[PDB]
Coordinates of C-alpha atoms and ligand atoms in Angstrom, one line a residue:
Chain K
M1 CA -50.7 18.2 3.3
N2 CA -51.9 14.8 2.9
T3 CA -54.3 12.6 3.8
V4 CA -53.8 8.7 5.4
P5 CA -57.8 8.1 5.4
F6 CA -58.7 4.9 7.7
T7 CA -61.8 2.3 7.2
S8 CA -62.5 2.0 10.7
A9 CA -60.2 0.6 14.2
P10 CA -62.3 -2.8 15.0
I11 CA -59.8 -3.3 17.8
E12 CA -57.8 -1.5 20.3
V13 CA -55.0 0.3 18.9
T14 CA -51.4 2.1 19.7
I15 CA -51.3 4.2 16.2
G16 CA -47.7 5.4 15.5
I17 CA -46.9 9.4 12.7
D18 CA -43.6 8.9 12.6
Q19 CA -42.5 10.4 15.7
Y20 CA -45.1 11.0 17.2
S21 CA -48.0 8.3 18.3
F22 CA -52.2 8.2 20.0
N23 CA -53.7 5.6 21.2
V24 CA -57.3 4.0 19.9
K25 CA -59.6 2.7 21.6
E26 CA -61.8 -0.6 20.6
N27 CA -64.6 0.4 17.7
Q28 CA -64.0 4.1 18.1
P29 CA -64.8 6.1 15.1
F30 CA -61.4 6.8 14.0
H31 CA -60.4 7.1 10.2
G32 CA -57.1 8.5 10.0
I33 CA -55.1 11.4 10.0
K34 CA -54.5 14.5 8.5
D35 CA -52.5 17.8 7.5
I36 CA -49.5 14.7 6.1
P37 CA -46.7 17.4 5.4
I38 CA -45.6 16.7 1.7
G39 CA -42.4 16.4 1.5
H40 CA -40.6 13.5 3.2
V41 CA -41.0 10.0 3.7
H42 CA -43.2 8.6 6.4
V43 CA -44.3 5.9 8.1
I44 CA -47.1 4.9 10.1
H45 CA -47.2 2.0 12.9
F46 CA -48.8 -0.2 14.2
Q47 CA -48.8 -2.2 18.1
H48 CA -51.8 -4.1 19.7
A49 CA -54.0 -3.2 22.3
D50 CA -54.0 -6.9 23.3
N51 CA -50.5 -8.8 21.1
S52 CA -47.1 -5.6 22.2
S53 CA -45.7 -8.5 20.6
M54 CA -45.4 -7.6 16.9
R55 CA -44.9 -3.5 16.1
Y56 CA -45.7 -3.2 11.6
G57 CA -45.8 -0.8 9.2
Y58 CA -45.5 1.1 6.7
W59 CA -42.9 3.0 5.0
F60 CA -44.8 5.8 2.6
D61 CA -44.8 9.0 0.6
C62 CA -48.1 10.5 -0.5
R63 CA -46.5 12.3 -3.4
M64 CA -46.6 8.6 -4.7
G65 CA -50.7 7.2 -4.7
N66 CA -53.2 7.6 -2.5
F67 CA -53.1 5.8 0.5
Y68 CA -55.4 4.2 3.3
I69 CA -55.7 1.9 6.3
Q70 CA -58.1 -0.8 6.9
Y71 CA -58.1 -4.1 9.1
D72 CA -58.1 -7.4 7.8
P73 CA -59.9 -9.7 10.3
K74 CA -58.0 -12.8 8.6
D75 CA -54.9 -11.9 9.0
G76 CA -55.2 -9.3 12.5
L77 CA -53.6 -6.6 11.6
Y78 CA -54.2 -3.0 9.8
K79 CA -52.8 -3.0 6.0
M80 CA -52.2 0.2 3.9
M81 CA -53.1 -0.1 0.2
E82 CA -53.5 2.5 -2.4
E83 CA -56.7 3.6 -3.6
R84 CA -56.5 3.9 -8.0
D85 CA -59.5 6.3 -8.4
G86 CA -58.2 9.5 -7.6
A87 CA -61.6 11.4 -7.5
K88 CA -63.4 8.8 -4.4
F89 CA -61.0 9.6 -2.4
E90 CA -60.2 13.1 -2.6
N91 CA -64.9 13.1 -1.5
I92 CA -64.7 10.0 0.8
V93 CA -61.0 12.0 2.4
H94 CA -63.3 15.1 2.7
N95 CA -66.2 14.4 4.3
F96 CA -63.7 12.9 6.9
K97 CA -62.7 15.8 7.8
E98 CA -65.6 17.2 7.4
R99 CA -67.0 15.2 10.1
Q100 CA -64.1 16.0 12.1
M101 CA -63.3 12.5 12.4
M102 CA -58.9 12.7 11.3
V103 CA -56.3 13.6 13.8
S104 CA -53.7 16.2 12.9
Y105 CA -50.8 15.2 12.3
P106 CA -49.2 17.4 15.1
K107 CA -46.2 18.8 13.8
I108 CA -44.7 22.1 16.4
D109 CA -43.9 25.1 13.0
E110 CA -40.1 25.0 14.6
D111 CA -39.3 21.5 15.1
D112 CA -37.3 20.3 12.3
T113 CA -36.6 16.1 13.7
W114 CA -38.9 14.6 11.5
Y115 CA -36.6 16.2 8.1
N116 CA -32.9 15.9 10.5
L117 CA -33.9 11.6 10.8
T118 CA -35.0 10.6 7.3
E119 CA -32.9 13.4 5.5
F120 CA -30.6 10.5 3.3
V121 CA -34.5 8.2 3.6
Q122 CA -36.7 8.9 -0.3
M123 CA -38.8 5.8 -0.7
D124 CA -36.3 5.0 -3.6
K125 CA -33.6 4.2 -1.2
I126 CA -36.3 2.6 1.0
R127 CA -37.1 0.4 -2.0
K128 CA -33.7 -1.5 -2.8
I129 CA -33.8 -2.4 1.5
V130 CA -37.6 -3.6 1.6
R131 CA -39.8 -5.2 -1.1
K132 CA -43.1 -5.9 -2.4
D133 CA -42.9 -5.0 -5.8
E134 CA -46.8 -4.5 -6.2
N135 CA -46.4 -1.5 -4.3
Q136 CA -45.8 1.8 -3.5
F137 CA -45.4 2.2 0.4
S138 CA -43.0 -0.6 1.9
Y139 CA -44.5 -3.1 5.4
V140 CA -41.3 -3.6 8.0
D141 CA -42.0 -5.3 11.4
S142 CA -39.8 -6.4 14.4
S143 CA -38.9 -9.4 13.5
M144 CA -38.3 -8.8 10.2
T145 CA -34.7 -10.8 9.4
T146 CA -31.7 -8.8 7.2
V147 CA -29.8 -10.7 4.8
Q148 CA -26.7 -10.7 6.5
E149 CA -28.7 -12.2 9.4
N150 CA -30.1 -15.2 7.3
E151 CA -27.1 -16.0 6.7
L152 CA -25.5 -16.9 10.1
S153 CA -35.2 -17.3 7.2
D154 CA -38.1 -17.0 5.0
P155 CA -36.0 -15.0 2.0
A156 CA -39.2 -13.0 0.5
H157 CA -40.2 -11.4 4.2
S158 CA -36.0 -9.7 4.4
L159 CA -34.2 -6.4 5.2
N160 CA -31.6 -5.3 2.0
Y161 CA -29.8 -4.6 4.5
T162 CA -25.4 -4.2 2.5
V163 CA -23.8 -7.3 4.7
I164 CA -21.2 -5.8 6.2
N165 CA -18.6 -8.2 8.2
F166 CA -15.1 -7.0 9.1
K167 CA -13.5 -10.5 8.7
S168 CA -14.3 -10.8 5.4
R169 CA -12.2 -11.2 1.9
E170 CA -14.1 -8.2 0.9
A171 CA -13.1 -5.8 3.6
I172 CA -8.9 -7.2 3.6
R173 CA -7.4 -6.3 0.7
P174 CA -3.7 -9.4 -0.2
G175 CA -0.3 -8.1 1.5
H176 CA -2.5 -5.6 3.7
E177 CA -4.3 -7.6 6.1
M178 CA -2.9 -5.7 8.9
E179 CA -2.8 -1.7 7.2
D180 CA -7.1 -2.9 6.2
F181 CA -8.0 -4.4 9.8
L182 CA -6.2 -1.6 11.3
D183 CA -8.0 1.4 8.8
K184 CA -10.9 0.2 7.5
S185 CA -10.3 2.9 4.5
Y186 CA -10.3 1.2 2.4
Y187 CA -13.4 -0.7 2.6
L188 CA -15.3 2.7 3.3
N189 CA -14.5 3.6 0.3
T190 CA -13.6 0.8 -2.6
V191 CA -16.4 -1.1 -1.1
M192 CA -18.7 0.0 -0.2
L193 CA -19.2 3.8 -0.9
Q194 CA -17.2 3.7 -4.8
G195 CA -18.9 0.0 -5.0
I196 CA -21.7 -1.0 -3.7
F197 CA -23.5 1.9 -2.1
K198 CA -22.4 4.5 -4.8
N199 CA -22.1 7.4 -3.0
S200 CA -22.5 9.5 0.8
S201 CA -26.8 9.7 -0.2
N202 CA -27.0 6.1 -0.4
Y203 CA -25.2 5.1 2.6
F204 CA -26.9 8.0 4.8
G205 CA -29.9 6.4 3.6
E206 CA -29.4 3.0 4.1
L207 CA -28.1 4.1 7.5
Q208 CA -30.7 6.4 8.7
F209 CA -33.8 3.7 7.4
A210 CA -31.8 1.1 9.9
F211 CA -31.8 3.9 13.4
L212 CA -35.3 4.5 12.6
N213 CA -36.3 1.0 12.1
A214 CA -34.2 -0.2 14.9
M215 CA -36.1 2.3 16.7
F216 CA -39.8 2.2 16.1
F217 CA -40.2 -1.5 15.4
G218 CA -37.2 -3.0 17.1
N219 CA -36.0 -4.8 14.7
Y220 CA -33.1 -6.2 16.0
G221 CA -31.2 -7.0 12.6
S222 CA -31.3 -3.1 12.0
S223 CA -30.1 -2.2 14.9
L224 CA -27.1 -4.3 14.3
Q225 CA -27.0 -2.7 10.8
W226 CA -26.6 1.2 12.3
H227 CA -24.1 0.9 14.7
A228 CA -22.2 -1.2 11.8
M229 CA -22.2 0.8 9.2
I230 CA -21.5 3.8 12.6
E231 CA -18.4 1.5 13.2
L232 CA -17.2 1.1 9.5
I233 CA -17.1 5.3 9.1
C234 CA -15.6 5.3 13.1
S235 CA -12.4 3.2 12.1
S236 CA -11.5 5.5 9.1
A237 CA -8.9 6.9 8.8
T238 CA -9.7 9.0 5.6
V239 CA -13.0 9.5 5.9
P240 CA -14.1 12.8 3.4
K241 CA -14.6 15.8 5.7
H242 CA -18.0 16.2 4.6
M243 CA -19.6 13.0 5.9
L244 CA -18.2 13.5 9.9
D245 CA -19.4 16.7 9.1
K246 CA -23.1 15.1 8.2
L247 CA -22.9 11.3 10.6
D248 CA -22.6 13.9 13.6
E249 CA -25.1 16.1 12.8
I250 CA -27.4 12.5 11.6
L251 CA -26.2 10.6 15.0
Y252 CA -26.8 13.8 17.4
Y253 CA -30.8 13.9 16.2
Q254 CA -31.2 10.3 16.5
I255 CA -30.2 10.3 20.3
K256 CA -31.9 13.2 20.7
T257 CA -34.9 11.6 19.8
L258 CA -34.4 7.6 21.3
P259 CA -36.6 6.6 23.9
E260 CA -34.6 6.7 26.8
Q261 CA -36.4 3.8 28.5
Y262 CA -35.4 2.3 25.4
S263 CA -31.7 2.9 26.1
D264 CA -30.3 0.6 26.8
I265 CA -31.1 -2.5 24.4
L266 CA -31.0 0.2 21.4
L267 CA -27.6 2.0 22.2
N268 CA -24.4 -1.0 21.5
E269 CA -22.0 0.2 23.8
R270 CA -18.7 -1.1 22.4
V271 CA -19.9 0.7 19.5
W272 CA -20.4 4.3 21.3
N273 CA -17.9 3.4 23.0
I274 CA -14.9 2.5 21.1
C275 CA -16.3 5.5 18.4
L276 CA -16.1 7.7 20.6
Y277 CA -13.3 7.6 22.9
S278 CA -10.4 5.2 20.6
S279 CA -11.6 5.1 16.9
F280 CA -9.1 7.2 14.0
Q281 CA -12.5 9.7 14.4
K282 CA -12.5 10.0 18.2
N283 CA -12.9 13.8 18.1
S284 CA -14.6 14.4 15.2
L285 CA -18.6 14.2 16.7
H286 CA -18.2 16.5 18.8
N287 CA -22.0 17.8 18.8
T288 CA -22.6 13.9 18.9
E289 CA -20.7 13.0 21.4
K290 CA -22.2 15.7 23.7
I291 CA -25.4 15.0 23.5
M292 CA -24.3 11.1 24.4
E293 CA -22.3 11.7 27.4
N294 CA -25.5 14.4 28.8
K295 CA -28.5 11.6 27.6
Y296 CA -26.4 8.0 29.0
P297 CA -23.3 8.3 30.4
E298 CA -24.2 5.6 31.6
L299 CA -23.4 4.1 29.1
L300 CA -19.9 5.6 28.2
Chain B
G1 CA -13.6 -22.8 21.0
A2 CA -10.9 -22.3 23.4
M3 CA -9.2 -25.1 24.5
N4 CA -8.6 -26.2 28.6
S5 CA -8.4 -29.3 30.0
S6 CA -11.7 -30.9 29.5
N7 CA -10.3 -31.6 25.9
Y8 CA -7.1 -32.6 26.4
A9 CA -7.0 -35.7 23.7
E10 CA -7.7 -33.9 21.8
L11 CA -4.1 -32.1 20.5
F12 CA -3.3 -36.0 20.2
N13 CA -5.7 -36.8 17.5
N14 CA -5.1 -37.1 13.9
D15 CA -6.7 -34.0 13.0
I16 CA -3.2 -32.2 12.0
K17 CA -3.1 -28.9 14.3
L18 CA 0.0 -27.1 15.5
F19 CA 0.6 -24.5 18.8
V20 CA 1.8 -20.5 17.8
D21 CA 3.3 -18.5 20.6
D22 CA 4.4 -15.5 19.8
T23 CA 5.8 -14.4 22.6
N24 CA 9.6 -14.8 22.1
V25 CA 8.9 -12.9 18.9
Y26 CA 9.9 -9.7 19.4
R27 CA 12.3 -9.1 22.1
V28 CA 13.8 -6.3 23.6
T29 CA 16.4 -5.7 26.2
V30 CA 16.4 -1.6 28.2
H31 CA 18.9 0.8 28.7
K32 CA 19.3 4.6 28.8
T33 CA 20.8 6.8 26.8
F34 CA 23.9 9.1 27.1
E35 CA 21.9 11.2 27.9
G36 CA 19.5 9.7 30.7
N37 CA 16.7 8.8 28.8
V38 CA 15.6 4.6 28.7
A39 CA 15.9 3.8 24.7
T40 CA 15.0 -0.1 24.0
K41 CA 17.4 -2.6 21.2
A42 CA 15.9 -5.7 19.8
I43 CA 17.7 -9.1 19.5
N44 CA 16.8 -12.1 17.2
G45 CA 13.2 -13.5 18.3
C46 CA 11.6 -16.4 16.9
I47 CA 7.4 -17.6 16.5
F48 CA 7.6 -20.8 17.8
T49 CA 4.8 -22.9 15.6
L50 CA 4.5 -27.2 16.9
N51 CA 2.8 -29.9 16.3
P52 CA 2.1 -31.6 19.3
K53 CA 1.5 -34.3 18.0
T54 CA 4.3 -35.4 15.5
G55 CA 7.4 -32.9 18.1
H56 CA 7.7 -31.2 14.6
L57 CA 8.3 -27.9 15.1
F58 CA 8.2 -25.3 13.1
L59 CA 11.3 -22.1 13.9
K60 CA 10.6 -19.8 11.9
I61 CA 14.3 -17.0 13.6
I62 CA 12.6 -13.1 13.3
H63 CA 15.6 -11.0 12.6
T64 CA 15.7 -7.8 14.2
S65 CA 16.1 -5.9 10.6
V66 CA 12.6 -6.2 10.4
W67 CA 11.9 -3.8 13.1
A68 CA 14.4 -1.4 11.5
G69 CA 12.2 1.6 11.0
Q70 CA 8.7 1.2 12.4
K71 CA 6.2 2.0 14.9
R72 CA 4.2 -0.4 16.9
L73 CA 6.4 -2.8 17.2
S74 CA 4.1 -5.2 19.4
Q75 CA 1.5 -4.2 17.4
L76 CA 3.8 -5.0 14.4
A77 CA 5.0 -8.3 16.5
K78 CA 1.6 -10.1 16.2
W79 CA 0.8 -9.6 12.1
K80 CA 3.7 -10.6 11.3
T81 CA 3.6 -13.8 12.8
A82 CA 0.4 -14.1 11.6
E83 CA 2.1 -13.3 8.3
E84 CA 4.6 -16.1 8.9
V85 CA 1.7 -19.1 9.3
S86 CA -0.1 -18.0 6.7
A87 CA 3.5 -18.7 4.4
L88 CA 4.0 -21.9 6.2
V89 CA 0.5 -23.6 5.9
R90 CA 0.5 -22.3 2.5
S91 CA 3.5 -23.5 2.1
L92 CA 2.3 -27.3 2.8
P93 CA 0.8 -29.5 0.8
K94 CA -2.5 -29.5 1.0
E95 CA -2.7 -33.1 2.4
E96 CA -0.4 -31.3 5.6
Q97 CA -2.3 -28.3 6.3
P98 CA -3.5 -28.4 9.7
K99 CA -7.7 -28.3 10.1
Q100 CA -6.8 -27.0 13.9
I101 CA -5.2 -23.3 14.6
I102 CA -4.4 -23.3 18.4
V103 CA -2.9 -19.2 19.3
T104 CA -1.4 -19.1 22.9
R105 CA -2.5 -16.3 23.3
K106 CA -6.4 -15.0 22.0
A107 CA -4.1 -10.6 20.7
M108 CA -2.9 -12.8 18.0
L109 CA -6.6 -14.9 17.3
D110 CA -7.8 -10.6 14.8
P111 CA -4.6 -11.1 13.1
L112 CA -4.4 -14.5 12.5
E113 CA -8.2 -14.7 11.7
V114 CA -7.8 -12.1 8.7
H115 CA -4.6 -13.7 7.3
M116 CA -6.4 -16.6 7.5
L117 CA -10.2 -16.3 4.9
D118 CA -8.5 -17.0 2.7
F119 CA -8.6 -21.2 4.8
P120 CA -11.9 -20.8 5.5
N121 CA -11.7 -25.3 6.1
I122 CA -8.2 -24.0 9.4
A123 CA -10.3 -23.3 12.8
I124 CA -8.4 -20.6 14.8
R125 CA -8.6 -20.8 18.1
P126 CA -6.9 -20.0 21.8
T127 CA -6.6 -22.5 24.9
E128 CA -7.1 -21.7 28.5
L129 CA -4.3 -23.9 29.5
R130 CA -1.3 -21.9 30.1
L131 CA 1.3 -22.9 28.3
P132 CA 5.2 -22.4 29.0
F133 CA 6.2 -22.0 25.2
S134 CA 8.1 -18.8 26.3
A135 CA 10.2 -21.0 28.3
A136 CA 11.9 -22.7 24.1
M137 CA 14.7 -20.7 24.7
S138 CA 15.7 -21.6 27.7
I139 CA 16.6 -25.0 25.5
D140 CA 20.4 -23.8 24.5
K141 CA 20.2 -24.7 20.5
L142 CA 17.3 -23.5 20.0
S143 CA 18.5 -19.7 21.8
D144 CA 21.9 -21.4 20.0
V145 CA 20.2 -21.1 16.8
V146 CA 17.9 -17.9 17.6
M147 CA 21.3 -15.8 18.2
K148 CA 23.2 -16.3 16.1
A149 CA 21.5 -15.6 12.4
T150 CA 22.2 -12.7 10.2
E151 CA 18.7 -13.4 8.8
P152 CA 15.6 -14.8 8.7
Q153 CA 15.7 -18.8 8.7
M154 CA 13.3 -21.0 9.0
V155 CA 14.5 -23.8 11.4
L156 CA 12.9 -27.5 11.8
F157 CA 12.9 -30.0 14.9
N158 CA 11.4 -32.3 16.7
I159 CA 11.6 -31.2 20.1
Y160 CA 10.8 -35.0 21.3
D161 CA 14.2 -36.1 20.3
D162 CA 13.0 -40.2 19.3
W163 CA 11.3 -39.9 22.8
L164 CA 8.0 -41.7 20.3
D165 CA 9.8 -44.5 19.6
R166 CA 9.2 -45.3 22.8
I167 CA 6.6 -43.4 25.0
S168 CA 3.4 -42.1 22.9
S169 CA 2.7 -38.5 22.1
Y170 CA 0.4 -37.7 25.2
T171 CA 2.9 -38.6 28.0
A172 CA 5.7 -36.2 25.0
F173 CA 3.8 -33.3 25.7
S174 CA 3.4 -33.8 28.5
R175 CA 6.9 -34.7 29.4
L176 CA 7.6 -31.6 27.8
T177 CA 5.3 -29.4 29.1
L178 CA 7.0 -30.3 33.0
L179 CA 10.4 -29.7 31.9
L180 CA 9.6 -26.3 30.1
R181 CA 7.9 -25.1 32.8
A182 CA 10.6 -25.8 35.3
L183 CA 12.1 -23.7 33.1
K184 CA 10.3 -21.3 33.4
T185 CA 10.0 -21.5 37.1
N186 CA 14.0 -21.8 37.8
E187 CA 15.3 -21.8 34.1
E188 CA 19.3 -22.5 36.3
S189 CA 17.4 -25.3 39.1
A190 CA 16.3 -26.5 35.9
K191 CA 19.2 -26.9 33.8
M192 CA 21.6 -28.1 36.3
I193 CA 18.8 -31.3 37.0
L194 CA 19.7 -32.3 33.3
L195 CA 23.0 -31.4 33.2
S196 CA 24.1 -32.3 36.5
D197 CA 25.1 -35.9 35.3
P198 CA 28.0 -35.6 33.1
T199 CA 28.3 -39.7 31.9
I200 CA 24.7 -38.9 29.8
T201 CA 24.4 -37.0 26.3
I202 CA 22.8 -35.0 23.9
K203 CA 23.3 -36.8 21.1
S204 CA 24.2 -34.4 17.9
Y205 CA 20.3 -34.3 16.4
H206 CA 18.3 -34.0 20.2
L207 CA 17.9 -30.5 22.1
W208 CA 18.1 -33.3 25.2
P209 CA 20.5 -35.9 27.1
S210 CA 19.1 -39.2 26.0
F211 CA 18.0 -40.3 29.2
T212 CA 16.5 -44.1 29.6
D213 CA 13.1 -44.9 30.5
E214 CA 13.9 -45.2 33.6
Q215 CA 16.1 -41.5 34.4
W216 CA 13.3 -40.5 32.5
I217 CA 11.0 -41.3 35.9
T218 CA 13.9 -39.3 38.1
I219 CA 14.3 -36.5 35.5
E220 CA 10.7 -35.7 36.0
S221 CA 10.5 -36.8 39.9
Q222 CA 13.1 -34.0 39.8
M223 CA 11.5 -31.6 38.1
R224 CA 8.0 -31.8 39.6
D225 CA 9.6 -31.3 43.4
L226 CA 11.7 -27.8 40.8
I227 CA 8.0 -26.9 40.6
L228 CA 6.2 -28.2 44.0
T229 CA 9.3 -25.5 45.9
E230 CA 9.8 -22.6 44.0
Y231 CA 5.8 -22.3 44.5
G232 CA 7.1 -22.6 48.0
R233 CA 9.8 -20.6 47.6
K234 CA 7.5 -18.3 46.4
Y235 CA 4.5 -17.9 48.1
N236 CA 5.6 -18.4 52.1
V237 CA 4.7 -22.7 52.0
Ligands
V5I1 C1 -29.6 1.9 -0.6 C2 -29.1 1.8 -1.0 C3 -28.5 2.0 -3.1 C4 -28.3 2.8 -3.9 C5 -27.5 2.0 -3.7 C6 -27.3 0.6 -3.1 C7 -28.2 1.1 -1.9 C8 -27.7 0.4 -1.5 C9 -28.0 -1.0 -0.6 C10 -27.3 -2.1 -2.4 C11 -29.8 -1.7 -0.8 N1 -27.9 -2.0 0.7

């Protein structure tokens, strides 16, 4: 069980850690988060009390290094950094624990939520999507654009999601125009799964990461990517049975966790009504259809 | 984007453009089976592809054999239309290819866009105009060539006959749309107006009678009367 200590909390901020969050008052004696479950990626995210504009945060895995947070008064944000001096880190953390200056990652034993949301989200997949190759952790914020968005403006600060475009030459084989447009199985199975993504685990990783960036940061482009990746599977007549069963579980936990008062901007009415009620897979997402109809029947 | 009354002179500028109307591609008669059920029988159809500036009409005849053994024919018809339009464009020299294709029904946008992905500099647009091109099969010579076809066939016409020698392409298109609206509203009365006088004839190489300028103003007035009336007899006014 690992720890992310903080140097201090100089500005009032709501701090998120995975699906949890807590409020820290300006200059309160806060020195970080302990008992973080090993074996999963995590995200630690920030919303300043004085500027609810820009949520930002860091995806990280405690197995990959010792990481801490330190506020930067010039750039005006809480920065994640790595401590290379392992012995020094251990000593700082022990002392903060002794003085009980850390909040506990508050996981309920029965609770598999975070696993279910990150089953395919590992740091090596996150690093292909997000770039700062000098750090082992990845920064994301609310305004970061996607590669596809920049083709429709700083390249260093972009999300590398695979550009899914149903009316594109890669999506449509010459002479199969109608077949490929009405049935996306070629596009899903051949262009995306066998050639760009390699397997369904990389595909699911990008899909889950896109959802989580949409939910935690309000990232517009990540919201679009999540829906595009669902629609590509649902609009394919031929999808391995094991992918359909896993997708149903994936979406079920995403819908279960989505904040109820954010459902209006995070969920696209057209995509979900098509996927659940018109698409080839309209009958293959039983868990997801049942939770959608009982929690968000207004959308449908 | 969409084409409407506001940008109507654009049709007659010097960017090559084509209208595509798919309303007569898939045509059927509905009839009873021996068992008392209902069945359809397809009849020959056509794609109506028209350059509004020159009058050039590319009439692709759709023979009923193209439907044999196919399902969801109304949907297939839209994709078949798009495949044929694409093929037409690819057959034209580059300097003759359109810069815009305007479809008369919005359901033709995605099929045509997908078939034209190879032509990113050709704009595919809908329109807010209610154009009466469905009535093209009320023109006797066009209907005749469609129904006599025993195989797929492309036939080329100028739908303006020789009018552009005397009037502009704006005026010719207005005259065409008036004639087709009349034929769509009351085919019989419309056709009576056009042939009432036996001394005015249709040249072997034309679709419409050889009216003088004066006779055309009369004809056009009679077509307006028809359209206003039939709308009378329709709304009781
Ligand atoms: C995530 C991943 C892993 C392996 C291969 C490809 C991908 C998807 C990218 C390219 C990042 N959009």
